[PDB]
Amino acid sequence: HMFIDMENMFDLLKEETEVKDLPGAGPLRFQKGRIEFENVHFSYADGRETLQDVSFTVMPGQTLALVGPSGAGKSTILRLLFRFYDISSGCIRIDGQDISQVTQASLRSHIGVVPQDTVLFNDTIADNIRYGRVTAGNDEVEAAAQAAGIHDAIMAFPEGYRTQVGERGLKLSGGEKQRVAIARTILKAPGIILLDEATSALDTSNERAIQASLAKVCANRTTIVVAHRLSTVVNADQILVIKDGCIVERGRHEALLSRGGVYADMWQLQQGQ
Ligand SMILES: Nc1ncnc2c1ncn2[C@@H]1O[C@H](COP(=O)(O)OP(=O)(O)OP(=O)(O)O)[C@@H](O)[C@H]1O
């Protein structure tokens, strides 16, 4: 270790939490939104492998549900797709293009995220929807709200689209707040949707309403979902069961059941025979 270059050690550490566009990198040429992870290894802090040889394909417009126990790497897969971090080997591609080789601005422009909980800013409801694409006009925000199903609700607000919401203003209902996150995604008109499902739930009516809107927004869009809801897993095109960074099994819900493996155990456990 007398021949180690300390500056190079710091450069390597820096590369662990920094993501740079390549010199001369172009825009992603997004076409249908096919997603591929090919043999992906990834570590957050250089101690230990958070994803181990992770390979899968999401064909354009199909849904992929990631399930498995705590700490498996599910959300990690979404963060890597948004290139929050660089991976350590393997490749992530969208429509065949390595995402580490394009401008990260162009990458993210094609990807809409619905996180677990919706962050509301102390600003008008319109600006809160506009957050999904800040360049967007009031006509676009309003159209997004309408497709999110909260336009009529907003029109009834004490100052309509100008009404201050968040902490300092009018309190949105649970359903409304979740439709704002939807409206943002709608406004983005992204080709890929990453959903990370909340572990809290509203009432049955609200959950069914919210799931119905989400499926409208995700239709014809390649979707990856960190799933908590049984209904979301059952309806997916493909399910990865992930344990400790490895995909231990995969298929559609019915094929995982009839496999009688880990997924089938989980399903039997939830049923409670
Ligand atoms: N930024 C980080 N730095 C270091 N470790 C992290 C970081 N983010 C997540 N981890 C750890 O990496 C592992 C994978 O986390 P990930 O968020 O992918 O979990 P998950 O499969 O979505 O399940 P969970 O519901 O437990 O979050 C977890 O043990 C997590 O605590």
Side-chain angles (χ1 to χ4, degrees):
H1 298 81
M2 78 166 262
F3 301 105
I4 268 165
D5 179 356
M6 178 154 317
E7 191 185 27
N8 183 250
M9 300 290 184
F10 276 109
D11 279 346
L12 289 172
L13 259 184
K14 180 131 109 89
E15 293 166 46
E16 281 167 24
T17 42
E18 95 165 356
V19 163
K20 280 211 141 175
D21 277 352
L22 261 17
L28 178 66
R29 288 176 286 86
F30 184 92
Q31 33 214 332
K32 277 204 168 103
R34 175 179 176 153
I35 297 162
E36 270 147 343
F37 273 47
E38 305 161 357
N39 304 109
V40 169
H41 297 253
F42 177 70
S43 274
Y44 281 109
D46 195 276
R48 48 173 259 174
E49 275 207 315
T50 145
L51 301 183
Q52 191 183 324
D53 190 27
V54 161
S55 322
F56 63 83
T57 304
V58 201
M59 292 299 279
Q62 287 184 336
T63 52
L64 174 76
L66 306 174
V67 304
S70 285
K74 302 172 230 89
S75 294
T76 300
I77 282 157
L78 312 193
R79 298 197 263 262
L80 288 173
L81 185 71
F82 211 72
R83 205 176 159 221
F84 266 157
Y85 310 85
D86 276 313
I87 53 155
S88 69
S89 72
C91 195
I92 302 167
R93 298 184 182 267
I94 289 169
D95 291 329
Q97 299 148 69
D98 176 350
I99 66 162
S100 64
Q101 311 287 291
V102 299
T103 71
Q104 49 193 301
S106 81
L107 168 66
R108 300 175 178 145
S109 73
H110 294 293
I111 305 180
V113 185
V114 187
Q116 290 194 317
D117 301 300
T118 305
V119 193
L120 291 179
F121 306 97
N122 298 137
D123 191 357
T124 69
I125 184 66
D127 286 341
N128 263 278
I129 295 171
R130 214 200 298 288
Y131 185 56
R133 169 163 56 88
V134 296
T135 61
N138 279 347
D139 56 312
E140 298 173 85
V141 164
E142 302 189 9
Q146 198 167 51
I150 55 190
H151 172 74
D152 292 323
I154 294 163
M155 290 295 286
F157 278 8
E159 296 84 30
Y161 281 90
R162 316 157 271 300
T163 305
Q164 293 291 324
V165 289
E167 289 204 46
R168 298 191 146 90
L170 178 135
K171 176 95 221 281
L172 301 183
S173 75
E176 286 163 358
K177 199 169 305 201
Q178 221 170 333
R179 304 172 175 279
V180 160
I182 299 172
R184 286 165 178 172
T185 301
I186 293 174
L187 190 72
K188 209 179 171 164
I192 293 178
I193 297 172
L194 318 175
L195 170 51
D196 191 348
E197 287 195 329
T199 63
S200 58
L202 302 180
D203 67 38
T204 307
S205 178
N206 280 278
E207 291 283 303
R208 259 189 204 123
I210 303 333
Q211 324 293 147
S213 295
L214 277 178
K216 264 191 229 38
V217 59
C218 299
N220 303 156
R221 282 162 181 180
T222 309
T223 302
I224 304 177
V225 50
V226 178
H228 294 268
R229 308 281 189 276
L230 293 182
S231 75
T232 305
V233 201
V234 173
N235 289 306
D237 295 313
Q238 177 181 186
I239 297 165
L240 312 180
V241 183
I242 302 162
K243 191 181 109 163
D244 298 329
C246 311
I247 293 169
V248 297
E249 48 179 67
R250 71 184 80 200
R252 296 189 51 80
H253 167 74
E254 295 75 8
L256 290 173
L257 289 191
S258 75
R259 162 75 69 171
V262 192
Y263 183 87
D265 294 335
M266 169 283 301
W267 193 256
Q268 229 204 41
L269 175 54
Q270 67 84 19
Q271 265 195 256
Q273 221 328 82

PDB file of all heavy atoms in Angstrom, residues 25 37 128 159 201 222 236:
ATOM      1  N   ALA A  25     -21.699  12.677 -25.025  1.00  0.00           N
ATOM      2  CA  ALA A  25     -22.889  11.829 -24.947  1.00  0.00           C
ATOM      3  C   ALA A  25     -24.066  12.489 -25.653  1.00  0.00           C
ATOM      4  O   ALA A  25     -24.249  13.709 -25.545  1.00  0.00           O
ATOM      5  CB  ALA A  25     -23.244  11.541 -23.497  1.00  0.00           C
ATOM      6  N   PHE A  37     -31.907  -5.188 -18.233  1.00  0.00           N
ATOM      7  CA  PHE A  37     -30.780  -5.249 -17.291  1.00  0.00           C
ATOM      8  C   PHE A  37     -30.080  -6.469 -17.744  1.00  0.00           C
ATOM      9  O   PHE A  37     -30.717  -7.530 -17.924  1.00  0.00           O
ATOM     10  CB  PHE A  37     -31.217  -5.479 -15.833  1.00  0.00           C
ATOM     11  CG  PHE A  37     -31.536  -4.219 -15.093  1.00  0.00           C
ATOM     12  CD1 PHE A  37     -32.357  -3.249 -15.675  1.00  0.00           C
ATOM     13  CD2 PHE A  37     -31.045  -4.016 -13.814  1.00  0.00           C
ATOM     14  CE1 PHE A  37     -32.656  -2.084 -14.982  1.00  0.00           C
ATOM     15  CE2 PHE A  37     -31.295  -2.862 -13.121  1.00  0.00           C
ATOM     16  CZ  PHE A  37     -32.114  -1.881 -13.698  1.00  0.00           C
ATOM     17  N   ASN A 128     -48.081  22.815  -8.355  1.00  0.00           N
ATOM     18  CA  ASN A 128     -47.795  21.488  -7.813  1.00  0.00           C
ATOM     19  C   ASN A 128     -47.946  20.377  -8.854  1.00  0.00           C
ATOM     20  O   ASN A 128     -47.227  19.406  -8.817  1.00  0.00           O
ATOM     21  CB  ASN A 128     -48.631  21.221  -6.576  1.00  0.00           C
ATOM     22  CG  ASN A 128     -47.886  21.506  -5.318  1.00  0.00           C
ATOM     23  OD1 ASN A 128     -47.110  20.667  -4.851  1.00  0.00           O
ATOM     24  ND2 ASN A 128     -48.126  22.664  -4.728  1.00  0.00           N
ATOM     25  N   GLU A 159     -59.868  29.110  -4.815  1.00  0.00           N
ATOM     26  CA  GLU A 159     -59.306  29.896  -5.929  1.00  0.00           C
ATOM     27  C   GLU A 159     -58.921  29.011  -7.155  1.00  0.00           C
ATOM     28  O   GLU A 159     -58.058  29.371  -7.962  1.00  0.00           O
ATOM     29  CB  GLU A 159     -58.140  30.759  -5.460  1.00  0.00           C
ATOM     30  CG  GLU A 159     -58.512  31.850  -4.431  1.00  0.00           C
ATOM     31  CD  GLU A 159     -58.549  31.327  -2.992  1.00  0.00           C
ATOM     32  OE1 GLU A 159     -57.797  30.374  -2.678  1.00  0.00           O
ATOM     33  OE2 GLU A 159     -59.347  31.874  -2.173  1.00  0.00           O
ATOM     34  N   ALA A 201     -52.294   2.528   3.080  1.00  0.00           N
ATOM     35  CA  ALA A 201     -53.419   2.352   2.163  1.00  0.00           C
ATOM     36  C   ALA A 201     -54.536   3.225   2.608  1.00  0.00           C
ATOM     37  O   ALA A 201     -54.672   3.485   3.787  1.00  0.00           O
ATOM     38  CB  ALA A 201     -53.911   0.850   2.129  1.00  0.00           C
ATOM     39  N   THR A 222     -44.135   1.095 -20.630  1.00  0.00           N
ATOM     40  CA  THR A 222     -43.327   0.124 -19.930  1.00  0.00           C
ATOM     41  C   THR A 222     -43.286   0.531 -18.462  1.00  0.00           C
ATOM     42  O   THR A 222     -42.850   1.630 -18.127  1.00  0.00           O
ATOM     43  CB  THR A 222     -41.935   0.166 -20.478  1.00  0.00           C
ATOM     44  OG1 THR A 222     -42.042   0.052 -21.883  1.00  0.00           O
ATOM     45  CG2 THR A 222     -41.127  -1.013 -19.940  1.00  0.00           C
ATOM     46  N   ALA A 236     -49.570  -8.068 -13.241  1.00  0.00           N
ATOM     47  CA  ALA A 236     -48.348  -7.733 -13.948  1.00  0.00           C
ATOM     48  C   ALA A 236     -48.126  -8.725 -15.091  1.00  0.00           C
ATOM     49  O   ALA A 236     -48.559  -9.857 -14.999  1.00  0.00           O
ATOM     50  CB  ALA A 236     -47.154  -7.746 -12.991  1.00  0.00           C
TER      51      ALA A 236
END
